[PDB]
Amino acid sequence: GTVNWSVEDIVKGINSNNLESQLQATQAARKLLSREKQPPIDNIIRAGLIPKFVSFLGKTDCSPIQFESAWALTNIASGTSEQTKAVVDGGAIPAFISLLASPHAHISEQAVWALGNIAGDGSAFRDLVIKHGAIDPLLALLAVPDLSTLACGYLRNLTWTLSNLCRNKNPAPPLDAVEQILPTLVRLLHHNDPEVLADSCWAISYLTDGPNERIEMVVKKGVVPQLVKLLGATELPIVTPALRAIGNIVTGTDEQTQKVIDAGALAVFPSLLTNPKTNIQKEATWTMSNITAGRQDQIQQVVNHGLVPFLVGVLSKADFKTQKEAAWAITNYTSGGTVEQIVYLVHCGIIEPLMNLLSAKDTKIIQVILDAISNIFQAAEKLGETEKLSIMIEECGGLDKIEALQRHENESVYKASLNLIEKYFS
């Protein structure tokens, strides 16, 4: 009786002076919008139904129509920016925020979902949602002694919505908004539902993607340990965002980086650096490059965990992108590491795989590598081993590639090449 209705019929009824007729019509709208494929969002919008739906949200006396219209608006906002804008333009935000206090959980759940889709669109709406005061009503929904007493799906919806209020960067969420949210976030990050866990990590990964002051307010809550732990999770949906947070945190101050190391992060990398899911491998190597780009005692930490061998491996065989992250990890290592350390690196077999990479069709990596070689020679120059090093690079045909690059087009390249040639060979 509310299945497959035509847009005009939905209009016909929503316009009647019959509450019940409207309810039936609003529900029919919901079903159209909740259909498997091609929900007639633009058709419903053109019919001018949003204002009507928004107004139904406030019909306290008829919770049923509140729900239906909520669900309907929710799906419209789930669309394009263009469409989401329509919902916002209709006054949906304040109304949805009002529903968070509803006595009907499935209704405030919808409101949660709805606000989730709106802040999702981006910075602008994200901040408008905050300005209408959504954060408190939301957080209030989690003010319970034990998160597990809440309906699983309901808890997931809130988590997801909260994560969206942490998302986007130009600009980043308002500092006080982040400060306000973080506490609940930390608590959610210790829940047993993999879903909640994944989105909790995403939220954190978002907050840690920015300036050091941002990273700090996160690290300041002492969640790094928990992240390192989730970093070891067996579910890829959790591991991915966790590795993102850790990877971001290590782009900050060395003190912040130290935190993840102290947390045991490194012990998981042998696994991560050989992980089957290509992308996890790229993130892992990228993270490693931001660790090798730090304090020597930190580089040493990498060395003690036997991660160099893995870096050699990654450099030797992996997706090119992962190799590019490896190139950096290496170059950064040789850029700030001790002599003894730059030596160990060569002893692990860094030279061959590193040379083979010079054949890569990418001027940028070619620089990072020559750059890296430079650093290595200089360490070998301090041990009068420059010649011996030359042989190696010559043994695996590296020199045969440096003189070729010498005749490369990019300036940075041919120049770096020549220097090496004359200064360390011919």
């Binding site: 993607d209 290590v250 782009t251 900050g252 990228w286 490059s289 931001n290 780009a293 730090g294 992250e325 950096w328 950064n332 850029s335 700030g336």
Partner: peptide, 7 residues
């Protein structure tokens, strides 16, 4: 800053 935010 050797730390690059490939973001």
């Amino acid at each position: 800053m050797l730390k690059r935010r490939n973001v």
